[PDB]
Amino acid sequence: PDEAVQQVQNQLQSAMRKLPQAVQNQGVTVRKTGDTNILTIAFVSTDGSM
Amino acid sequence: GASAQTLENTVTQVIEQNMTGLDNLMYMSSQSSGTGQASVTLSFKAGTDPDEAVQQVQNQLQSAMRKLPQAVQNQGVTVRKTGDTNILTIAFVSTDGSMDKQDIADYVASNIQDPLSRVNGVGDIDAYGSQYSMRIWLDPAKLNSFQM
Amino acid sequence: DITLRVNQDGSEVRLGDVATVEMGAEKYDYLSRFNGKPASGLGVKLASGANEMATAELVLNRLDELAQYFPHGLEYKVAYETTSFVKASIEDVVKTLLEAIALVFLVMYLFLQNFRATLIPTIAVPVVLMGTFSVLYAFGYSVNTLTMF
Amino acid sequence: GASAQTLENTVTQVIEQNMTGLDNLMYMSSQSSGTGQASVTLSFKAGTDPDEAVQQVQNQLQSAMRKLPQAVQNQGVTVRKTGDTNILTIAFVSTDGSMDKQDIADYVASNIQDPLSRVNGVGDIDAYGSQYSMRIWLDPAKLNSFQMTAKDVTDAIESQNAQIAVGQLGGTPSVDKQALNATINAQSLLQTPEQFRDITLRVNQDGSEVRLGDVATVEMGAEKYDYLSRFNGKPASGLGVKLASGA
Amino acid sequence: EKYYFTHEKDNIMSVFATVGSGPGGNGQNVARMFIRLKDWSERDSKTGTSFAIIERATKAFNQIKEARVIASSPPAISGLGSSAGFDMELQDHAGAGHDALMAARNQLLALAAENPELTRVRHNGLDDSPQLQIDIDQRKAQALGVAIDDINDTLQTAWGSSYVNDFMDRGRVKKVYVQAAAPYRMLPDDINLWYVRNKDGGMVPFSAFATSRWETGSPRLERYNGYSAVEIVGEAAPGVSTGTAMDIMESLVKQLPNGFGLEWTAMSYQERLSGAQAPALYAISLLVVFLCLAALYESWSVPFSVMLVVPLGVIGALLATWMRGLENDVYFQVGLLTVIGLSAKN
Amino acid sequence: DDINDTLQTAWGSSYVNDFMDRGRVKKVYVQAAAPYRMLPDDINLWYVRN
Amino acid sequence: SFAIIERATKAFNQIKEARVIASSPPAISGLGSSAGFDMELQDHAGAGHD
Amino acid sequence: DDINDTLQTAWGSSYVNDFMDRGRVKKVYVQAAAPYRMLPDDINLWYVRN
Amino acid sequence: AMVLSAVFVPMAFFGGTTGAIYRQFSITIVAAMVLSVLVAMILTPALCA
Ligand SMILES: CN[C@@H]1[C@@H](O)[C@@H](O[C@@H]2[C@@H](O)[C@H](O[C@H]3O[C@H](CN)CC[C@H]3N)[C@@H](N)C[C@H]2N)OC[C@]1(C)O
């Protein structure tokens, strides 16, 4: 997986300069999907002040 | 539209100055052609892992990409672990003659070149014909006529 | 119809009034012919550290698949391929290997004069060769001209 | 343009966030400077493959790339395997004395540093000198005298000292029976300081010409004036050869 | 193509010519032709072999004087090089200059053509060509109110290609290029047809502030390592070993002026690296065999009896190789080792 | 923008473009002369264009 | 979980404002229904979206 | 160009810069207020300078 | 078999491209010889018997 993501990132570097400036400002991320989510912690304001 | 000297000054020399610290680098050969293409071939010692070599080259290159001229950046530099000899050279010909050379080249570059470039094992596939493009041919007489 | 300037009179200056627009190639550097006929070519370059024969077989196969949707009259024709020589040479080496086995069998039959006795050394050849191929696979080598020789 | 504290809070800490948890990681060390340069140095366990470590760091970088400021992303983030093993520190000195320290530094950085940096096993070559560069020393009094600004000089130089891609004679597609095909060179990069002194900033209506030398002191100097090395009490320049890991 | 389809039409399966692409670099003056022969069975195997075809073709092509057409066989190893023969880079260590490098290249080629020990010595690149130089009077340009940026922009957009943006054609986003029409960029006088706009909006001709001048230049600049270099490929004459030919080339480059050195590359580099490990191998292998025999027979004498039959097989192998006119190579060496082993067993 | 550009160019060396030097491409830097970027009061010596 | 999602599926099929489905998470995202199939009906001729 | 800009930065967002909030750099977005980009007629509410 | 493998074992150690070529032959022939030992002392006696 590391080799694959590295190759994908390398190939993308030859194209990020062709993308619209807005897309470049937002940033383009290369990620390996399939990660396991151990927890999903939700933060709630009981008082309602926040 | 660049020149050989222009390329050798603004691109080829700049890339070479940054190709430093590469492991098992036997020798590097670079050429700057008047056709507008500049290349730098880094041949590594036998037994080196091509992926590691490509990783190192890309890591070094990325520092110098902003130094390159704007047009070069827009065109984009490519780093491929490829040789020079073609394993196979396919020729596309219109038997009926319905499609001329430009139509054949455009169809190849549109529908065939990209899928082949993603086949496993294909380091690179250059084309002997370029895709279609909206060519606009300026007429200087008319440009001066309308004061534009 | 791209408008370059609209005069106060209202007469606009379109792009077609100052230039000629046509759809052509983006690069006019190459001009290739096949057997005296117009054509366009592709040069497939093997990735460093990959099997040439397998890559060429995969490429051609993909091309066949793509060939299905070709416009009427368009055909691809392999003009310069290298794996053909490799395959032919390997086939020739296999041929001479089998012929060598046959000749060795003949010589042993001549000297021993017993078919039953002759069969014993002959059987020893495929066993040893298959073991050698197993060793080659274990060591990560590949069937090539040197190994076949 | 970021203060040291701002740089540490916004860039270095964000980079450190995700990289914690890398395989075979011993410790991290950020060195957020005051000029706006960040540096995170990850040290891995002995026997870890440096390449694999660099690859892993680069892969983990894209996870936190979005959290960095826009300017930081535009500048770019570089990952290099850094060592500290100084195999050699060669000092270059002119025995005759005909060469100034800047001349020695320029010669080294132009003819010596690059060939040595390609030698197998040489991870990096720290330079204790800098090559030549056309230094344009502005004078604010003269600039105000001619109603010029610093940007006027910069734009004039950037326009009159550019390498232009003009094209070719008879470039394809071409008219039939074209006789010749040749490259068309154009305005080329300037070479001597006197050429820069003759750069025309502004032509007045009266024909008066405001040359660059009229508002500036063009002189060929060092690209980086920071370094100043002396060998046995004499002016000199040096290279610090740094060994690549595993050589 | 007419030559190939007329003189030898019983061996050529197909030819494929690509004008604009060459082994020494792309350009309008170069072309690379891929010729594909028929199966070995259909060819004569006596006159239809690739080598004989290449010989006849190279004779017919040396007859051609309009261009330098060279028929070459593919390299022995796919990765190493683009063609068979020695490969050398003629660098410029002293940094004398491009003109000095080209002069040295011509001198070396002349010296090589002097020696019959080397054949087809040539420069794997493009020769220097005249190239136009458009010099613009900056003072005269801005005296008329014409910005230097404007004239540079119109010059590079008109004569060169300007990739403005992309457009969508049948589902693909292809490029859009703006360039001068073909009839208006063919001659040096076509520069004067272009009008730039000054501050006041008036149109000024290019002839007002720009002139043209011919100058010599190179369409392709190659740099081996960090030094400007000219690759000089070639072939070795029959009989003289490739290593000896390489040494002759080293003598030739020594005959050149100071500052220019050579570095063998690709197949030549690897060939120079290897080839001297044979005698060592033989000696170590023979010593190992003697020790194994001494272990087997428990004597220091019986192995001498056995080891004396190695020459009895070596002489026969050498005689067979020389009689057929073959060459001492890697295959030969391994054969010799096999012969030694079989003689030892006997 | 003019004020910031003047300050940056005057006090920090502004890498404009490159120049050719004996076959090597080298940088061109624009900066204020040494005596004019030494005291905090030297900032008052510069003039921007209205 | 199965009885709960069954009752939820009934009650949500009663809902007509939108489409809401309650489903247990797959153990591995890769695995799907053994009888299912994924097909990508492509447009090789570039006919158009419509 | 003015028309396209007004449309892009009014109806769509525009990530212009970053600002330091409590020691962290957030994003700055410029966009039209909600009531002015809700209906097709809201297009006519925008004015472009000639 | 010992002498046959002895003539070929040193061949593999040599490095470089030429060494690689040698190694190919060496590994192949040495493995073939070892298997011939094993075959000659396992299969052939049984067949003869
Ligand atoms: C081919 N599988 C990949 C491949 O990238 C592999 O690359 C290693 C390469 O890192 C080693 O190279 C190593 O060489 C020296 C170690 N003494 C120092 C540098 C280090 N990278 C090579 N000796 C073997 C390759 N297969 O490293 C990681 C991997 C997952 O095993």
Author numbering:
A (entry chain A): 100 to 149
B (entry chain C): 51 to 198
C (entry chain C): 248 to 396
D (entry chain B): 51 to 297
E (entry chain C): 594 to 939
F (entry chain B), H (entry chain A): 742 to 791
G (entry chain A): 643 to 692
I (entry chain C): 446 to 494
Task: Quote what the paper states about this structure.
The Escherichia coli acriflavine resistance protein D (AcrD) is an efflux pump that belongs to the resistance-nodulation-cell division (RND) superfamily. Within the HAE-RND class of membrane proteins, AcrD is distinct in that it is a specific aminoglycoside efflux pump that mediates resistance to a variety of aminoglycoside drugs, including amikacin, gentamicin, neomycin, kanamycin, and tobramycin. The AcrD efflux pump is a substrate/proton antiporter. It works in conjunction with the AcrA periplasmic membrane fusion protein and the TolC outer membrane channel to eliminate aminoglycosides and minimize the toxicity of these drugs.
The structure of trimeric AcrD bound with Gen (AcrD-Gen) is very similar to that of trimeric AcrD in its unbound form (apo-AcrD), as they both present as asymmetric trimers. Superimposition of these two trimers give rise to an r.m.s.d. of 0.4 Å, suggesting that the structures of these two trimers are very similar to each other. A closer inspection of the trimeric structure indicates that the trimer contains a “binding” protomer (open periplasmic cleft), an “extrusion” protomer (closed periplasmic cleft) and a “resting” protomer (closed periplasmic cleft). Unexpectedly, an extra density was found at the ceiling of the central cavity formed by the AcrD trimer. The shape of this density is compatible with a Gen molecule, indicating that Gen is bound by AcrD at this location. It was observed that the “extrusion” protomer of AcrD uses D99, D101, and E102 to anchor this drug. A tunnel is formed at the periplasmic domain of the “extrusion” protomer, which binds Gen at the central cavity via hydrogen bonds. This tunnel spans the entire periplasmic region of the “extrusion” protomer, starting from the drug binding site at the ceiling of the central cavity to the bottom of the periplasmic funnel created by subdomains DN and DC.
